[PDB]
Amino acid sequence: RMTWNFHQYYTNRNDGLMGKLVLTDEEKNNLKALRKIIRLRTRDVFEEAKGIAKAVKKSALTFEIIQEKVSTTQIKHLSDSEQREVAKLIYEMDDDARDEFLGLTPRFWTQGSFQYDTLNRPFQPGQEMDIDDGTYMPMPIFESEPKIGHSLLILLVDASLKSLVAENHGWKFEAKQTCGRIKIEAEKTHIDVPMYAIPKDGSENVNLALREGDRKWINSDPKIVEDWFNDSCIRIGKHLRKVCRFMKAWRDAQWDVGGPSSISLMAATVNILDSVAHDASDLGETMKIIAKHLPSEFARGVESPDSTDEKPLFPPSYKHGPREMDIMSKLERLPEILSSAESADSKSEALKKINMAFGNRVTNSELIVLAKA
Numbered sequence: 001r002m003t004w005n006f007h008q009y010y011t012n013r014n015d016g017l018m019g020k021l022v023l024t025d026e027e028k029n030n031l032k033a034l035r036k037i038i039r040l041r042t043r044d045v046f047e048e049a050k051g052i053a054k055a056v057k058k059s060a061l062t063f064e065i066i067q068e069k070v071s072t073t074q075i076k077h078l079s080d081s082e083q084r085e086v087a088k089l090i091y092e093m094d095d096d097a098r099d100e101f102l103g104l105t106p107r108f109w110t111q112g113s114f115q116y117d118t119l120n121r122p123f124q125p126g127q128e129m130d131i132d133d134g135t136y137m138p139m140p141i142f143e144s145e146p147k148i149g150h151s152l153l154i155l156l157v158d159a160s161l162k163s164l165v166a167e168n169h170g171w172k173f174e175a176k177q178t179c180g181r182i183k184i185e186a187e188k189t190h191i192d193v194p195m196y197a198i199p200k201d202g203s204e205n206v207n208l209a210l211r212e213g214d215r216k217w218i219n220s221d222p223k224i225v226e227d228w229f230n231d232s233c234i235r236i237g238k239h240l241r242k243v244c245r246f247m248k249a250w251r252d253a254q255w256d257v258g259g260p261s262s263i264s265l266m267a268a269t270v271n272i273l274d275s276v277a278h279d280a281s282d283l284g285e286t287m288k289i290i291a292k293h294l295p296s297e298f299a300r301g302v303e304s305p306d307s308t309d310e311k312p313l314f315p316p317s318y319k320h321g322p323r324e325m326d327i328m329s330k331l332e333r334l335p336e337i338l339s340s341a342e343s344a345d346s347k348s349e350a351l352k353k354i355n356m357a358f359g360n361r362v363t364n365s366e367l368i369v370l371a372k373a
Contacts, residue, residue: 003342004350005371006284010246012367020361021120021245031114034191035133038182039108041074042135042160042193046106048073049156052090053098063091074163075156082155089152097147100139104148107136111194111222113262116229118244122188123252123359130262131191132179134222138200146197150209150216157195177211203308219308225263228305232270239280243290244269246283246358253359254330258323260298264313267305268297284342285373291335298331342373 013019023031052069055061061069067087070076075086093101112132113119122128135157139146158173161180165171174181179194197207203221210216233240244266251259272293278286301316315324334357341354351365 001372003371003373004344004347005282005369005373006287006341006350006354006367007282008367008369009351009354009362010283010287011242012364015362015364016367017246017249017358017362018242021249023119023121027121030187031129031131031189031191034184034189035110035131038133038160038164038191038193041164042106042157045074045156045160045163046104049075049086049090049152050102050104053093053101056090056093057095057098057102063087066091073159075159077163077166078155078159082158086152086155086159089149089155097149100147101152104137104139107138107198109134109136109222111226112192113248115226116241116244116266118241118248118262118266120245120248120252123249123361124256126256127188127252128183128185129189131189132194133191134194134196136196136198139197141199141205142197145216153195153197154209154211157193161193175211177213178208179211221306224306224308225304229266229270232274236270236273237280239283239286240270240273242283243273243287246287247290247294249358249361250334253357259330260314260327263304264298264302265294267302267313268294270305271297284338288335288338288342291331291338294334295328295331298328 008016010017013022052066052073055069056066067084070083070087070090075083078086110133112130114131119129119131137148137153139148158175158180161182162173165173165182170184170186172183172185174183176192179192181190181192183190195209197209197217199205203224204219206219206221206223207217208220210218244262247265247269248262251262251265269290272290273286276289276293278289280286298314299317301312301319302314304311304313314327317324317328320328337353337357341350341357344350344353347365347368350368351362355362
């Protein structure tokens with residue numbers, strides 16, 4: 001019978017949902033420039049701290065002199081206590097720890113959606129682009145804590161980020177458990193800088209630094225999820241990134257703050273498209289298929305693609321509190337919204353209904369076309 005088709009509603013890069021979600025080249029370039037600013041400052045902070053250790057290798061300087069040298073570097077932007085601690089850690093280094101520090105140069109690699117290429121323009125006031133650029137410290141393998149030190153490394157990355165925040169109006173710093181964060185409200189953007197220890201020259205030795213707790217390090221390699229997703233796009237096809245964007249857009253529209261993680265949605269969606277027949281020639285039908293199957297994916301718990309990670313991306317239903325129940329409720333409603341939109345009385349009502357899933361972003365009802373199904 002007659003149905004409304006939404007393939008252009010979703011895919012049109014002029015003014016369909018893809019057109020509303022994909023960053024402009026200027027926006028992408030701005031994020032890349034922000035990342036470069038952070039990377040440069042981090043390299044420079046480490047060179048400064050290393051210059052001091054070089055001085056101490058040459059002559060066993062007093063603590064007071066080491067301190068005064070620390071105070072002329074970007075580390076001056078840390079609190080008095082923290083500056084003292086850097087100075088102390090440099091002062092207390094033995095020959096072997098100091099040598100390895102002198103050979104340490106931070107490396108970089110971007111993770112998250114900027115790297116998955118599924119970063120959406122933010123929807124609701126207050127929502128920001130979640131950007132991640134890890135700092136990697138090549139060091140010998142260690143059992144519980146390396147030479148150089150967990151404390152010194154975090155202090156120097158904090159020094160890099162805090163020195164940028166001091167130099168730029170509209171930038172704020174936040175300490176998170178897994179990263180330092182720079183927030184730039186005015187640009188609807190925050191950039192997260194997790195720090196990793198990695199071997200010197202295969203995921204068993206990539207260690208994420210944790211800011212507080214009974215563990216300073218946890219084995220977590222962002223490349224595992226990155227490779228899994230790139231492999232899934234090749235396996236499933238070009239439409240995978242598109243439907244993941246649409247599910248993330250749904251989430252941004254249903255919750256101002258909160259909702260399921262982007263990775264939980266991506267993992268579930270990959271499982272569905274790997275196992276259920278669908279048709280990239282009609283992404284309206286494909287989204288209906290995904291929507292029909294997401295509730296059962298989420299109710300049983302969404303497993304991480306990284307098998308070494310035993311914490312689910314979303315908990316199974318016997319572990320649900322009010323927030324997970326709220327997510328289940330909105331997941332259950334989504335295929336109903338999409339079905340109702342398909343059988344609406346008019347184009348304008350079709351648009352109104354499907355925009356109750358993705359928000360009022362697409363306004364062009366000409367993208368919706370009368371079809372048979």
